[PDB]
Design a binder for these strands. Sequence first.
RNA 1: UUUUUUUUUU
RNA 2: UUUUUUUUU
Lengths: 268, 270
Amino acid sequence: SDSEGFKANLSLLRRPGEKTYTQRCRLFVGNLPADITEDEFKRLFAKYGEPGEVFINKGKGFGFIKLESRALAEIAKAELDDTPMRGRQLRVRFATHAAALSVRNLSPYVSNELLEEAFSQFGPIERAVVIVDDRGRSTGKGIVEFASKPAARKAFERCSEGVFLLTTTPRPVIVEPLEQLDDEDGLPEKLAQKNPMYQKERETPPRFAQHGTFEYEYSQRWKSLDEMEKQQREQVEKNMKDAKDKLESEMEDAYHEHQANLLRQDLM
Amino acid sequence: SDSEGFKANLSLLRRPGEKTYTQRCRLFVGNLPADITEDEFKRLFAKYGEPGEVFINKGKGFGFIKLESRALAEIAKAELDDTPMRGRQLRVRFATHAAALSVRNLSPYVSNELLEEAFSQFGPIERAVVIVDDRGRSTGKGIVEFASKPAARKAFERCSEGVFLLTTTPRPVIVEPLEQLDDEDGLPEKLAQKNPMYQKERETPPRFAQHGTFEYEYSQRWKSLDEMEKQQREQVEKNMKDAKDKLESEMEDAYHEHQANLLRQDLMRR
RNA sequence: UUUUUUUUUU
RNA sequence: UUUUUUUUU
């Protein structure tokens, strides 16, 4: 099995200039009994270094706990999800950041730094990242993870009511909520059992479709629909880029055909 | 920075149930000499434990190297990016992942394990994952990091071209390439410099727009086009989901109404 | 052409 | 031959 850690380990597990006990560290353990104590929890993750921001709603059997690093936590979940524990089996996963903001239409020269500079005005930041492609050039979209949920909510309103921008040439930042998901651990078969009918569905083994069946043509149609679904979206995207890609330059006709007209009248 | 104890250390960075020297460990180092040796390259990541498959295109001043954990590479990349080295500053960042597939229209029953159980037939797989929401459930959307590009390629071919399915109730799997991006290290000002005009743009500082113009006005009109782009793509989705959502049932009538058709006809040879 | 800038193998 | 997992301050 996985060694639990060591004091050694703990500083290692700090992903390299990660701030400790980020919200990204907080973990939701659901499913705990009612008479679970404050220190009985905390004991469960004695294993995992000096705990932090810990909390329970005993009435619903659930609670939070921040650990040293996101790596460290992720092991926590690793080691703990589906622990039997007074009959119940604890369910651990990460807590829902919900302070997390996706941002788009960033110039290619927004640096991770500068994004935090900008948005640090709406409060304590936990992290601000500009995303990068396979060659590590900007992809116009970024992440701001906020300290407090007010801080986010205020950055949201402000930036989506008002017009926030970042560099000399003007591109409003478009601040939509980030929706979280896990591609790291995902869904194991472990806990894909304890749903209604794994078997009913999985009773037929992965396979290719018979070049004739109903079940083939059904698919080949559904596919077809989807290929189309794409074609449409792909066209909307193309329509609309073409649409921004035009604008900047016919905008510079509000300042170039509006004076081109008004010039020789006054001092003549 | 630059870590005090290792070896005793590395194993601990490995990940949980990470296959080590996965392609997600593969580092691109670009920007190096004519005259780098192989030896010299590996000696570079001496620090970082047993080196994996490594490779230099001396002809183009770049090479690759796999390290034990994604974890550990991350570090090397960090300790090493921009290292001056006979005239140049080497570039370390993660190499590209050809051999990474996105899958879709995934049964909500499809388990991480099962996913690779299926795909393993096109080649060894490095990992496969069902993505899950905040409430850890299927997003009908997976990932299958493969062995090699051939593997991912035959996997792709055989799934666009054929009709692969995974559970009993027929949902084709939609393999497409999955394109690669870094929500992690991202883009530091560090090297945000070394493009032509950082300043030109950064000259103006992060601000609101002037409730008059002009930058304001161009910006709310850009905002318009956008909310509109949304509306459109929002609809394409609801439209075509309707289309599909229909199909399950409106197909169950090529198989009952073309079949309760052909029973009564021959029932009159009198 | 000092270099950042191209370059991401079967 | 034991229990909140469409419940996340």
